[PDB]
């Protein structure tokens, strides 16, 4: 179940209002971390998200991710984070300048081409310059805010860029 | 193998009364192989959001739509299972959360909701067809009469009659 996941590497979570329950084991693999997260037995609470501690491989589980307030996202190279889609924002506000959902095909169905990568697309758009807009793999971002919304370079040299299809969240009921 | 990933609503297909909309068919084998090429966007002029395996002429539909699109309505057959993309049925709650559709199934406190069908370990009247359009189906977390707590289910522990789930409001600031 780890692709039901979002992961961000080098990166764990601290709570700073104490009173948000944690619950942590020793394990093998990150597999086994989402498998419970995913079945969410033997936690008191909704897992939103747990990290994966590689050096004491120790889970983490989470009732909260980095979007919730009461908790900071710190660097870390022995820890991977990975946050249940569930609980990821899956709609547009908006221009979806705070788009941090998993979308990676553009409107007209196209995959996403990584950010850093610059074939077959020649780009500016670096991860380490816009820290904060998570350009994270090939996932549909809007870094300047721009009126099309979440967008990616697309892996098809006949167009450049496209706009994704990400719903508002006025569009529905 | 990503037809787990999906929402599942049996004897369904989806029509589209609009005919700009575009829709996409393959003669296939099993549903499984629907939701691969969703699931990867393989060979799709369009961001396939909902598809549906109809087990008569063993054919699936790909579409850039889903149950709650404008222009689209439900069509009821016994040869036809429509499969929802979560990436595209909003995963957060609007005011109290009356139109939530979402899959999430664990109350607040980590406890797996009872499916509203079922009268174990609790009896209820929040019967599926007491309640339409509120899609009172599997055990889903539901606000079926729009009360103050947000969505909620009876749980399947015997000791608990009913909680709360712990879904995000998509705004507010």
Same mark, same amino acid.
Not at 29 to 46: E, I, M, S, Y
């Given at each position: 179940?780890?692709?039901?996941?979002?992961?961000?590497?080098?990166?764990?979570?601290?709570?700073?209002?104490?009173?948000?329950?944690?619950?942590?084991?020793?394990?093998?693999?990150?597999?086994?971390?989402?498998?419970?997260?995913?079945?969410?037995?033997?936690?008191?609470?909704?897992?939103?998200?747990? #990290?994966?501690?590689?050096?004491?491989?120790?889970?983490?589980?989470?009732?909260?991710?980095?979007?919730?307030?009461? #908790?900071?996202?710190?660097?870390?190279?022995?820890?991977?984070?990975?946050?249940?889609?569930?609980?990821?924002?899956?709609?547009?506000?908006?221009?979806?300048? %705070?788009?941090?959902?998993?979308? %990676?095909?553009?409107? %007209?169905?196209?995959?996403?081409?990584?950010?850093?990568?610059?074939?077959?697309?020649?780009?500016?758009?670096?991860?380490?310059?816009?820290?904060?807009?998570?350009?994270?793999?090939?996932?549909?971002?809007?870094?300047?805010?721009?009126?099309?919304?979440?967008?990616?370079?697309? %892996?098809?040299?006949?167009?450049?860029?496209?706009?994704?299809?990400?719903?508002?969240?006025?569009?529905?009921?």
């Amino acid at each position: 179940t780890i692709h039901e996941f979002k992961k961000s590497a080098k990166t764990t979570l601290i709570k700073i209002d104490p009173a948000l329950k944690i619950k942590t084991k020793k394990v093998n693999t990150a597999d086994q971390c989402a498998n419970r997260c995913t079945r969410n037995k033997g936690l008191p609470f909704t897992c939103k998200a747990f #990290v994966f501690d590689k050096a004491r491989k120790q889970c983490l589980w989470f009732p909260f991710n980095s979007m919730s307030s009461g #908790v900071k996202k710190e660097f870390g190279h022995e820890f991977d984070l990975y946050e249940n889609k569930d609980y990821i924002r899956n709609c547009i506000i908006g221009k979806g300048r %705070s788009y941090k959902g998993t979308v %990676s095909i553009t409107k %007209s169905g196209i995959k996403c081409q990584p950010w850093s990568s610059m074939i077959p697309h020649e780009h500016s758009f670096l991860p380490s310059s816009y820290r904060g807009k998570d350009l994270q793999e090939n996932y549909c971002r809007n870094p300047r805010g721009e009126e099309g919304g979440p967008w990616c370079f697309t %892996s098809n040299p006949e167009v450049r860029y496209e706009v994704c299809d990400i719903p508002q969240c006025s569009e529905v009921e």
